[PDB]
Amino acid sequence: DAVFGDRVRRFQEFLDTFTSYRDSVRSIQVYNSNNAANYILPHRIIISLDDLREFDRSFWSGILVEPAYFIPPAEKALTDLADSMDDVPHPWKLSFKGSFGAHALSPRTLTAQHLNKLVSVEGIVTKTSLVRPKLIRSVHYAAKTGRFHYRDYTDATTTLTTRIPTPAIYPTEDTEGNKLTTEYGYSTFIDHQRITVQEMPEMAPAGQLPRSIDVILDDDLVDKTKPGDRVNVVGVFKSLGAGGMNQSNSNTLIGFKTLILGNTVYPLHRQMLTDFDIRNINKLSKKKDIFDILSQSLAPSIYGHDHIKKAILLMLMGGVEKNLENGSHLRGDINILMVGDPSTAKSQLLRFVLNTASLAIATTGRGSSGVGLTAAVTTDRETGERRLEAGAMVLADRGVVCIDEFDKMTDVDRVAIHEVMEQQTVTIAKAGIHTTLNARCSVIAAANPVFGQYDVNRDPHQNIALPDSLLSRFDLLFVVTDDINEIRDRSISEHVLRTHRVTIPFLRKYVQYAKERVIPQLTQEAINVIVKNYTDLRNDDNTKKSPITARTLETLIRLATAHAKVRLSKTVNKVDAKVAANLLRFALL
Amino acid sequence: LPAHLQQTFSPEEIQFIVENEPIKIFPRITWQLITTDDKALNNMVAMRSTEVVLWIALLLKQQSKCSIVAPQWLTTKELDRKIQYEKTHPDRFSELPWNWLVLARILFNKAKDDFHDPIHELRGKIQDLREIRQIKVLKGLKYLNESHLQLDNLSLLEINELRPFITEIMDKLREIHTASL
Amino acid sequence: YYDIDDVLADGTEFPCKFQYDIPGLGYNPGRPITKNTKLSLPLWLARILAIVGPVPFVELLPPDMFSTKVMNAIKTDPVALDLHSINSHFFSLAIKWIMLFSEKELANVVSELLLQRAQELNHHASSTSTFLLKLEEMEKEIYKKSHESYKDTKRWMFK
Amino acid sequence: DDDNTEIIKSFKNFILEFRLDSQFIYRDQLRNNILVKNYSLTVNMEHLIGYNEDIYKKLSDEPSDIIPLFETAITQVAKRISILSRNSLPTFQLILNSNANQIPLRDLDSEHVSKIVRLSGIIISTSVLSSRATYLSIMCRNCRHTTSITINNFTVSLPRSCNCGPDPYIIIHESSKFIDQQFLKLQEIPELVPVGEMPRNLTMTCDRYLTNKVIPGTRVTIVGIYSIYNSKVAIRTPYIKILGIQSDVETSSIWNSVTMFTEEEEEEFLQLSRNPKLYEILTNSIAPSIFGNEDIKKAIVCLLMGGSKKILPDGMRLRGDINVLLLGDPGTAKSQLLKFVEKVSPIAVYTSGKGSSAAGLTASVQRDPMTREFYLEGGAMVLADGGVVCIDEFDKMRDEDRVAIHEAMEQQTISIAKAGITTVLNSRTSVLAAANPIYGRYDDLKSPGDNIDFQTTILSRFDMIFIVKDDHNEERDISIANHVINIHTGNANAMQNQQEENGSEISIEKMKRYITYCRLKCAPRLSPQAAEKLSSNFVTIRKQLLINELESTERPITIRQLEAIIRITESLAKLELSPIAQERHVDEAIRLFQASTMDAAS
Amino acid sequence: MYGDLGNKLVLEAKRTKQLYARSNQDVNLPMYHEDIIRNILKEVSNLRKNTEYLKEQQQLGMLDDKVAKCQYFVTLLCMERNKRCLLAYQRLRTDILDSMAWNNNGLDLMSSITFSQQDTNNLSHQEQEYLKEYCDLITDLKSGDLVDIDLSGSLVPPSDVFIDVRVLKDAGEIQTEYGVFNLIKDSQFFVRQSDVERLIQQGYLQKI
DNA sequence: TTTTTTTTTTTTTT
Numbered sequence A: 001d002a003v004f005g006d007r008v009r010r011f012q013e014f015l016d017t018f019t020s021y022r023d024s025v026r027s028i029q030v031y032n033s034n035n036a037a038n039y040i041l042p043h044r045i046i047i048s049l050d051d052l053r054e055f056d057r058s059f060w061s062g063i064l065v066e067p068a069y070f071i072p073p074a075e076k077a078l079t080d081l082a083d084s085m086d087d088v089p090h091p092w093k094l095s096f097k098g099s100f101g102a103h104a105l106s107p108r109t110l111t112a113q114h115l116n117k118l119v120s121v122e123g124i125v126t127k128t129s130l131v132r133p134k135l136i137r138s139v140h141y142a143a144k145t146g147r148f149h150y151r152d153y154t155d156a157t158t159t160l161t162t163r164i165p166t167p168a169i170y171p172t173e174d175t176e177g178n179k180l181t182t183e184y185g186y187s188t189f190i191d192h193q194r195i196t197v198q199e200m201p202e203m204a205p206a207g208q209l210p211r212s213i214d215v216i217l218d219d220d221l222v223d224k225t226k227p228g229d230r231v232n233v234v235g236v237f238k239s240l241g242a243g244g245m246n247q248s249n250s251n252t253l254i255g256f257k258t259l260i261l262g263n264t265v266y267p268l269h270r271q272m273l274t275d276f277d278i279r280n281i282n283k284l285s286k287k288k289d290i291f292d293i294l295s296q297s298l299a300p301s302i303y304g305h306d307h308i309k310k311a312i313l314l315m316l317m318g319g320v321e322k323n324l325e326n327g328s329h330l331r332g333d334i335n336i337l338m339v340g341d342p343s344t345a346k347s348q349l350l351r352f353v354l355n356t357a358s359l360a361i362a363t364t365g366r367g368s369s370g371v372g373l374t375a376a377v378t379t380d381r382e383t384g385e386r387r388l389e390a391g392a393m394v395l396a397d398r399g400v401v402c403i404d405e406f407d408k409m410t411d412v413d414r415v416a417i418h419e420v421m422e423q424q425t426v427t428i429a430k431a432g433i434h435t436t437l438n439a440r441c442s443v444i445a446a447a448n449p450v451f452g453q454y455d456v457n458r459d460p461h462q463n464i465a466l467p468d469s470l471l472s473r474f475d476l477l478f479v480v481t482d483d484i485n486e487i488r489d490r491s492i493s494e495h496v497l498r499t500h501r502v503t504i505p506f507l508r509k510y511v512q513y514a515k516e517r518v519i520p521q522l523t524q525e526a527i528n529v530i531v532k533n534y535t536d537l538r539n540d541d542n543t544k545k546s547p548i549t550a551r552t553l554e555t556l557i558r559l560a561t562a563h564a565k566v567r568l569s570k571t572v573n574k575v576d577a578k579v580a581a582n583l584l585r586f587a588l589l
Numbered sequence B: 001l002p003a004h005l006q007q008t009f010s011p012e013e014i015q016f017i018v019e020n021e022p023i024k025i026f027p028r029i030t031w032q033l034i035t036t037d038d039k040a041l042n043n044m045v046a047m048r049s050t051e052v053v054l055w056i057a058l059l060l061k062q063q064s065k066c067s068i069v070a071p072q073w074l075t076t077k078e079l080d081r082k083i084q085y086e087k088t089h090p091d092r093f094s095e096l097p098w099n100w101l102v103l104a105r106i107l108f109n110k111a112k113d114d115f116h117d118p119i120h121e122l123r124g125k126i127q128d129l130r131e132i133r134q135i136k137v138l139k140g141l142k143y144l145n146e147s148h149l150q151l152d153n154l155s156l157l158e159i160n161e162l163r164p165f166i167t168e169i170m171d172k173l174r175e176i177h178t179a180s181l
Numbered sequence C: 001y002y003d004i005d006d007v008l009a010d011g012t013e014f015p016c017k018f019q020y021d022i023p024g025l026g027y028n029p030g031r032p033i034t035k036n037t038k039l040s041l042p043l044w045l046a047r048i049l050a051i052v053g054p055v056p057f058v059e060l061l062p063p064d065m066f067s068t069k070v071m072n073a074i075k076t077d078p079v080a081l082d083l084h085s086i087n088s089h090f091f092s093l094a095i096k097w098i099m100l101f102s103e104k105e106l107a108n109v110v111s112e113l114l115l116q117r118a119q120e121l122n123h124h125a126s127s128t129s130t131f132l133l134k135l136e137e138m139e140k141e142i143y144k145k146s147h148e149s150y151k152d153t154k155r156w157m158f159k
Numbered sequence D: 001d002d003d004n005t006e007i008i009k010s011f012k013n014f015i016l017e018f019r020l021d022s023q024f025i026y027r028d029q030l031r032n033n034i035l036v037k038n039y040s041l042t043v044n045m046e047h048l049i050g051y052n053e054d055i056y057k058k059l060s061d062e063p064s065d066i067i068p069l070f071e072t073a074i075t076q077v078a079k080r081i082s083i084l085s086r087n088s089l090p091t092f093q094l095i096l097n098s099n100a101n102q103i104p105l106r107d108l109d110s111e112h113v114s115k116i117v118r119l120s121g122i123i124i125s126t127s128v129l130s131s132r133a134t135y136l137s138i139m140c141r142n143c144r145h146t147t148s149i150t151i152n153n154f155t156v157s158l159p160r161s162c163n164c165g166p167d168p169y170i171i172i173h174e175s176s177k178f179i180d181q182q183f184l185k186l187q188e189i190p191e192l193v194p195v196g197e198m199p200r201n202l203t204m205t206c207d208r209y210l211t212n213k214v215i216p217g218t219r220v221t222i223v224g225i226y227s228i229y230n231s232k233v234a235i236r237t238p239y240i241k242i243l244g245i246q247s248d249v250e251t252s253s254i255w256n257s258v259t260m261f262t263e264e265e266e267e268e269f270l271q272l273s274r275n276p277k278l279y280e281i282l283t284n285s286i287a288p289s290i291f292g293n294e295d296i297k298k299a300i301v302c303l304l305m306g307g308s309k310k311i312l313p314d315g316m317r318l319r320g321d322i323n324v325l326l327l328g329d330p331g332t333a334k335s336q337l338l339k340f341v342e343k344v345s346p347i348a349v350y351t352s353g354k355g356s357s358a359a360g361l362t363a364s365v366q367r368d369p370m371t372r373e374f375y376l377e378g379g380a381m382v383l384a385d386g387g388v389v390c391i392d393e394f395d396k397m398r399d400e401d402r403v404a405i406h407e408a409m410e411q412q413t414i415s416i417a418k419a420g421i422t423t424v425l426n427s428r429t430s431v432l433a434a435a436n437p438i439y440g441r442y443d444d445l446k447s448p449g450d451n452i453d454f455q456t457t458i459l460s461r462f463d464m465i466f467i468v469k470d471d472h473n474e475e476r477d478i479s480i481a482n483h484v485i486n487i488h489t490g491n492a493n494a495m496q497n498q499q500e501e502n503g504s505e506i507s508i509e510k511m512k513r514y515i516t517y518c519r520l521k522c523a524p525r526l527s528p529q530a531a532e533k534l535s536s537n538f539v540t541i542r543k544q545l546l547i548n549e550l551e552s553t554e555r556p557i558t559i560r561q562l563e564a565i566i567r568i569t570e571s572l573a574k575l576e577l578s579p580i581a582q583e584r585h586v587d588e589a590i591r592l593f594q595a596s597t598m599d600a601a602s
Numbered sequence E: 001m002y003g004d005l006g007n008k009l010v011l012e013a014k015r016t017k018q019l020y021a022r023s024n025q026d027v028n029l030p031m032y033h034e035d036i037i038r039n040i041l042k043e044v045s046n047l048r049k050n051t052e053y054l055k056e057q058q059q060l061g062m063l064d065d066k067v068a069k070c071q072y073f074v075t076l077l078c079m080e081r082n083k084r085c086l087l088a089y090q091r092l093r094t095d096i097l098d099s100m101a102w103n104n105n106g107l108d109l110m111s112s113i114t115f116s117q118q119d120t121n122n123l124s125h126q127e128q129e130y131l132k133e134y135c136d137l138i139t140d141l142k143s144g145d146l147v148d149i150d151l152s153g154s155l156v157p158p159s160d161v162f163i164d165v166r167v168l169k170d171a172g173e174i175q176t177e178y179g180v181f182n183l184i185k186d187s188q189f190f191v192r193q194s195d196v197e198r199l200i201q202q203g204y205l206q207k208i
Numbered sequence F: 001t002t003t004t005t006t007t008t009t010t011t012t013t014t
């Protein structure tokens, strides 16, 4: 393998020329020892492939083409270099970027030639085969002859190059027959995983279904990504396994299940605000009509319903949280529902909450099993371990669940749905594992009138379609009438017609920032009013309609707090409460 | 306004070009004709080698009062020496009569009877000849740059059929390149 | 000019901020727009807006299609990238920006783009699949004259 | 093998020598396809039988032992064609088709096994791409001897010769070459020969340039070879390896798609647009069977073209094209009509369910009981995406995903959060509702609403809703009753339509290619004022149905109804192949839904 | 919002270039857009209306403001823009029609452009007058030669020399010139290239 | 030289 060293001395020139990589190299080499001065760093480096055409194109192409012959000596080169660095006081890894490609492709298609080559391939993460650590290097200590003894085990999944079947036994008393004890806490174990990726369902060509394919995640790549996330996954596509021709079994056509090793795994759509941007965020934040402004831009086509819009943004903040000490939490995230005659744009309105909201996942009615319930993947998958897997609502943790036809979901689902909102967790007894896992989620749905257009005529009782405690947990019930005004109908027409014929993306960039910086806490000014308001409700709102509870007031907290994040005020203020007093009026009238 | 083609010549036309070239024939016949570009002749000796223009020979062969000679370049054993030269010279296109592809179709259409065993032979040899020559063309096409072109030996049919592609492209090349300054 | 593509080529907006205040807004009620207000503008007007001011009326930030992103994107595997997706008027355009702004490197790159493209484009001389969709308009027409040349040629070749 | 090498020479001969006057078709085809990177050639077995009978007589005898040889020469042929030497050049594929002679599936047993069989059937479901070996090499686990196997087709375990033993070899995975394999599951044609029983499905397998050539659920023709393999007495599984496959007419279509072009189409499609009768002659394409019912008859057309689908940012997108109701008294012809409609669609699924025939009307994800792990099983709506929706018995549809119909028609999607998978998958499918109304004509003296299940909202979900009322009335019958006995024997009305073919009428297998054609060009759109006209028309439709409701009548109208009538405009316009739509153009779409407004008034 | 309106038109010019380009060639230009150019024209007259107004305004309170200096260097550009669009639209619209002239008249005995170029009414009258005036001009090229040409005829090279043409539902005979060949439905011949050229373009003759 | 597997989805049913 003289050429193996040739790839290295070719790339050795690339070491220090250009040296723009050595900065982060050294940086790892420093922040590790700075954590060593504490009182965690991964070893691997992003390399934009873009630069490499500026040295050897002849080396460039093969990096994608036959990485088994190229990437391991340059891999060795990272380690070689970094070892030449200070200071005395590990195999490393790589990623790259792209800057692609041939080799630009989506998971929907692959092979023949596409195999055995570096590729970037993007998409949905499912089903997340769960983590187990893996054996690589063996080590043992002889006595009384002493010394230190070892082996190095190599799976077909490790590295790239084909190698003799190392596995699987401890060397165990190498000659002369001296006892050899496992070196545990010495010998190397890198964690391993296999994660399939489904191509985006909407970009599917035809009635043909989505096809996922697995990608092995070694070292860091594990725990980086949960299921359901959009991820560009890069690495080299291995031809793996016997062709059924290893043995007499089986006499058949089928064979060669295969996946991709390495490499990078970037998430896609967080975010990156620099300075110049957030300066705009705050420049706008100063303006006092901006709440309404942000509300209007939500629905480019849709008419008005600005009170509903506001309500949505109020859910888009999260309305902070407060966790008790040694007691149960006070839910701060906001749960609402839409109701009204068909063609209210309720479903389509949900589809706006599909993209800007930074998750979570929406569902049409069904739904289940238990939605966010894991429903206990069974049996095992794999190696004799019964496993759970992310359910809808779980995947939706700290995100937006949305529902088309929450009225059409089963009565049996509703049980765990109560468990979704008050208890705000997930209880699992099924086989099984008894874990109570956090279900804390922002949840909005829509329901149609139980019977026809009578949504307006009939009392809310019987118009519910989903009694009862379901109604309590809802911060708002929104009745939207299809009722006719020809005066309005002209307006209804023209904007709808100019349809087919204040910026939202920035709205996401702003909302995200308003979450973490900052939480408002509270001031007594809102308190000096909304109390008067609540009792005012109870002594009045019962002479009109129902219901009224303490909970509906707790929403005054959440609502006010939501707009409090909208003002980006470091604290809650009275006028925010006035925004709440606004929203609940139109909630019941 | 010709519209079509327009810069390049139609193969249909270029055949009209080559049809104006001189060749030998074997007359059946023993006024004048006067014509224009003909000169010759007085009543032309029957069953003897004689030089005329192609298209006249085409027409009198259509009356079969003449017989067209196979060009001495066109033969099996000859095509072999040339195509062999072609394989052992990956860059140069060797040497050809230059109106030939047209001549081939032209003669095979009518003059077919005069040759000895052109059938199922030459059409293959020239198909292959045109083949290795065609790949020599296409492979030469990566050196394409402004402003220089050596096509050296290439036939007018060969060339004209591909004319628009190098011409039109090369302009997009040179224009932008000198435009840089 | 009198090829539709010439008036059509300037139909592309380029990022440009003005170096001056411009009373009499070209678009609505400024009426002036303050210096360094970012705007996408058609090349036909913009082209001269640099030539006259000796400081110009307009700053002219680099276009989104000439980004290092795309410029090396083409450098990776020229055949695969879809030119129709980018503008689609590019060689009909990039020529104009490389004239107006007078760059020297990207040229030597771009020419090679068209080269490789044509290396492939000739290979379609013989009588698509996914490819035929993704070509630029001039890249689409070169195909016309080239192909149709052959398309007549073979029909002559036999009867 | 030098015998096989003489056969090799025989095929090299076959290619270089062969002539159709005068170009050598396969020879041209090669250098044509090498720049396509097709690396394959489709050869008529008749030019072969015309070239030398002998080689076929032995080819037809054990083709399996020869077909690769046939390739080993033509892969060499490219060597003497593609380039000159003194890379890497992939081993060729060959695809051979022939007119041949058709054989029915039910009669396929033993006998013809290990030979060529032309036959059609229809594919049910596509297997996932499965890659297979082409070249592989191996070092020994013990002696480190370097072996090189060319894996060829058409099992065969790895050879053990340089303890060393028993078989010490493991694949060099790094250096190996590869190909895809499809594993077609395909079904016999619906018509023959079921006798009494259920349709069989016999499994076949594509590879290389054959893969993904055929959609799930489309009529197709495969030639291939009848063979067997164990696959856990001797009881080995029947199958057919695939060469070559050809689509039944066309089918081409997929993807993006095809023309190609055969120029006469554009002209002939434009002349259609210059024919003032074209809209109406399409109407006369739809029912050679059905004389009359011209209203709904005009209503079918506008759906198939696809209507307005406009995606405007943000992710908001409005559907196309729409929905239609055939509900009316039996005698409507609407099932006969629908059985025209589905055959018209380039790609669609006919559902009388419940869901069709055995289909979960929506895709129902079902665990593979082997190796666990739920996988989505597909669905009628799913497979029918970008195609027609056929529904009978809509009185009886599955109530739970009835809502997934209540949704997929609109949001162009179905969300499955069930089990593991959250993917919201596309049904852009356009529904036509053919169900029979409750009690026939008895809902006419009643409230015509709530006719469909327990809610009126389904109507809103639909668009072009049409109530077909046939009274026993005079002379409109006596002419269609006259039409009848002609229709039956001797097709005295089906001859009368063939002189209208020469005079006027469309061929309707054409109509497929028409609607395939103009659905792939970008979406048509109305000029502003026809829209404002939709505004003053509808302000009075809505005004009228509040005033109609001055009687406190329960009901019907929405704002998706106006928009519904919008999409009909771009439909009827997409007929025209015109980016715009004229005022009156839109107007007969108005008169076209106007009957449904009186369906609201009745 | 400004010089854009013409871009719709030049786009249409693209498509109508495509309607002659392959095409296959039936010509038949869709229409002169009389409405839209006039929209442009009301803005092109509006532009120099604004500019003439500013030419008044520059003289009073603007005082040759460096920005006031701009809009002459600015709006006038859109004047050139429109001009470009309109010009090239019409140079297209004409080059196509002059081509439609050259090919056929058409040919004997043209004997008239009447019913030829079926557009007739649909083609705008300024172009109608122009075109017919232009083939009036081309008749003078029939005057200049004195070949005889038959520029309109004899486009493709001769061969050889005799062909078999079949008549399609055509009578006939108009054959008074030369000699009378008696045109009947389903009538073919064996005849020299010469006489072919006219009734082959006249549509009467067919097979070559 | 062999290893090892019961929920979840849907269904037809009193």
Ligand SMILES: Nc1ncnc2c1ncn2[C@@H]1O[C@H](COP(=O)(O)OP(=O)(O)NP(=O)(O)O)[C@@H](O)[C@H]1O
Pocket (backbone or CB within 6 Å): A301, A302, A303, A340, A341, A342, A343, A344, A345, A346, A347, A348, A349, A404, A448, D317, D318, D406, D407, D410, D457, D461, D559, D560
């Ligand atoms: N501003 C708007 N207001 C109302 N509807 C609109 C508006 N703009 C568009 N629409 C359309 O109105 C329809 C709304 O349907 P929608 O109610 O959201 O679905 P749905 O509720 O699931 N059907 P249903 O369950 O019966 O209520 C869609 O076709 C939208 O495209």
Ligand SMILES: Nc1ncnc2c1ncn2[C@@H]1O[C@H](COP(=O)(O)OP(=O)(O)NP(=O)(O)O)[C@@H](O)[C@H]1O
Pocket (backbone or CB within 6 Å): D289, D290, D291, D292, D329, D330, D331, D332, D333, D334, D335, D336, D337, D392, D434, D435, D436, D480
């Ligand atoms: N133009 C026509 N109009 C009416 N009936 C026709 C026509 N042509 C044929 N028929 C005959 O009448 C029947 C028309 O179908 P029809 O009686 O309406 O049943 P259907 O409603 O389509 N089926 P279903 O959807 O379950 O109600 C056919 O069975 C034909 O025999």
